[PDB]
Design a binder for these strands. Structure first.
Ligand code: TTP
Ligand code: MG
Ligand code: MG
Length: 539
DNA sequence: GACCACGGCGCT
DNA sequence: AAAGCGCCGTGGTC
């Protein structure tokens, strides 16, 4: 029930391929095949074979499409059963799993993969039968978006290598001064990178009171938060906090990034994973460029390393208070929609409160602090943690939480409805109908249940913002190609583009408009836009 | 070398 | 009682 034919596969066939490694940009195409009707075609010389295809249909189409772009081809990605599955159940994140759940085994033979892609698409496509809403998301968002992600990955972003190279030597020296002090304070050297060794030193050798425990092993935590609480109990704590910062940045960004520069491009190429999140957001792997530093001074110094090619400019666009505007539209809370209809900003307002300064005195750093608070409280943070963090009394934190929700009466009602329906149906959905199954909504253990609920009511808000960003990327991409501009990165509610200096303004202008008008809501969407030679200056 | 579980921590 | 991610050392394998 599956014969073999000479390479030349008929049009519309599903491809199957094997890579030396999972990164499309660094991978060696080991094998390539195709499956159609009831037979399979294997290419004797894979690279040569790529030229024959007109489209990539099958598991991980975008990835082969990326490698294709890397070789000068324009093979756009088409149907991909992974996208259908992801839409049926966001827990379908890997081929291994999707193949086992929907009909087969993910092997290492290209032929078998092409055959697998075909039968999988057939079964999954049959399951979406009637799911008009998921069908809309597939054809109007996911499938086209895959093409967008391909170009983004293949294009990559420029990095100032010698800059980070020198930054490394500089920080290494500061790390040395910090570890050296810590050791003097402890009275003896030990591996500071080891949480276990630091536990003993802090809680046994020194007489510092433990503040909390780790989740799976119950050890006394040495988290930055636990360290905050002990900042004044001993001189060694501040030191460890700075060591933690520097080494985190150094080992995670400063040193690894310069070594990931592809030779044929001289740019960094990240993976944009389309089926890896339970809410519908994307993620970046290998170089995960969705978590590049930005808070601290050294963090900012690192972001300054992402630069535009000579003669071009980076254009950074970011939705304003994105998830709050979504909540207003989902909850229907008129007081909250009025906030936006009146051009207000909850982050600036919370910041004003936090630091005891008039709005107009809040800086971007203070406002950034307030966002974690606003979203922390919205999504479930406890009075206890809130009081701890802000460093205020329990009652003062308990009051803020009360006022917050009392101020937007409809939000809690919406939350409550999202859960009831979630309990009955077994899943929750976004504005466009993206679904996430949350069975634990009925666990008989409060601990597990309430955690399940927090995950449950957050999905529609985070997911909807995701649908929006993806939709916008799909509408924006073609407009950019015609203007000679390129899309480089996506950071959940942010886009980083690269445009020739003579068009950077028109591009910024166009992107902003495209994004703000993506899908009109009961509240306007505002996009902040910036232009500059490096990512930091862009925003 | 190649992986994994964890505690941590960078970003949204 | 914030949610969603991926990556880095440490320990401990294999
Ligand atoms: C920063 C942050 C954001 N989010 C979500 C909600 C929002 C979305 C995007 O993040 P941000 O862009 O940082 O926040 P924002 O869109 O609310 O506002 P702006 O950029 O204008 O400052 O991610 C959280 O759930 N937790 C967080 O800590
Ligand atoms: Mg934003
Ligand atoms: Mg953002």
């Amino acid at each position: 029930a599956l014969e073999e034919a000479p390479w030349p596969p008929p049009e519309g066939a599903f491809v199957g391929f094997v890579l030396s490694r999972k990164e499309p940009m660094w991978a060696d195409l080991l094998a390539l095949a195709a499956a159609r009707g009831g037979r399979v075609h294997r290419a004797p010389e894979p690279y040569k074979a790529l030229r024959d295809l007109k489209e990539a249909r099958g598991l991980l189409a975008k990835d082969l499409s990326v490698l294709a772009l890397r070789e000068g081809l324009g093979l756009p990605p088409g149907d991909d059963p992974m996208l259908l599955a992801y839409l049926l159940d966001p827990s379908n994140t890997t081929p291994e799993g999707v193949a086992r759940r929907y009909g087969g085994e993910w092997t290492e033979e290209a032929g078998e993969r092409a055959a697998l892609s075909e039968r999988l698409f057939a079964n999954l496509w049959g399951r979406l039968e009637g799911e008009e809403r998921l069908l809309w998301l597939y054809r109007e968002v996911e499938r086209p978006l895959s093409a967008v992600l391909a170009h983004m990955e293949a294009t990559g972003v420029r990095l100032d290598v010698a800059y980070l190279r020198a930054l490394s030597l500089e920080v290494a020296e500061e790390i040395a001064r910090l570890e050296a002090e810590v050791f003097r304070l402890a009275g003896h050297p030990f591996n500071l990178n080891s949480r276990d060794q630091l536990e003993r030193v802090l809680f046994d050798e020194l007489g510092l009171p433990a503040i909390g425990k780790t989740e799976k092993t119950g050890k006394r935590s040495t988290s930055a938060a636990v360290l905050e609480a002990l900042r004044e109990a001993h001189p060694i704590v501040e030191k460890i906090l700075q060591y933690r910062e520097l080494t985190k940045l150094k080992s995670t960004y400063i040193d690894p990034l310069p070594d990931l520069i592809h030779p044929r491009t001289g740019r960094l190429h990240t993976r944009f994973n389309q089926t890896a999140t339970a809410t519908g957001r994307l993620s970046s792997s290998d170089p995960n460029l969705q978590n590049i530093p930005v808070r601290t001074p050294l963090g900012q110094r690192i972001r300054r390393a992402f630069i535009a090619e000579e003669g071009w400019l980076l254009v950074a666009l970011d939705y304003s208070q994105i998830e709050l505007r979504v909540l207003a539209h989902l909850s229907g809370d008129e007081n909250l929609i009025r906030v936006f209809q009146e051009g207000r900003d909850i982050h600036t307002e919370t910041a004003s409160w936090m630091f005891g300064v008039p709005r107009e005195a809040v800086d971007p750093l203070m406002r950034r602090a307030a966002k974690t608070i606003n979203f922390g409280v919205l999504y479930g943070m406890s009075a206890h943690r809130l009081s701890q963090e802000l460093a205020i009394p329990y009652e003062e934190a308990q009051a803020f939480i009360e006022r917050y929700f009392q101020s937007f009466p409809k939000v809690r009602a919406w939350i409550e409805k999202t859960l009831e329906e979630g309990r009955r149906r077994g899943y929750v959905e976004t504005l466009f109908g993206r679904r996430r199954y949350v069975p634990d909504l009925e666990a008989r253990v409060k601990s597990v249940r309430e955690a399940a609920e927090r995950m449950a009511f957050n999905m529609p808000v985070q997911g909807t913002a995701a649908d929006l960003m993806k939709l916008a990327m799909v509408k924006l991409f073609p407009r950019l190609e015609e203007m000679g501009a390129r899309m480089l990165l996506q950071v959940h509610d942010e886009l980083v583009l690269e445009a020739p200096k003579e068009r950077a303004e028109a591009v910024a202008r166009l992107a902003k408009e495209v994004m703000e008008g993506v899908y009109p809501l009961a509240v306007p969407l505002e996009v902040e836009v910036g232009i500059g030679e490096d990512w930091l200056s862009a925003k």
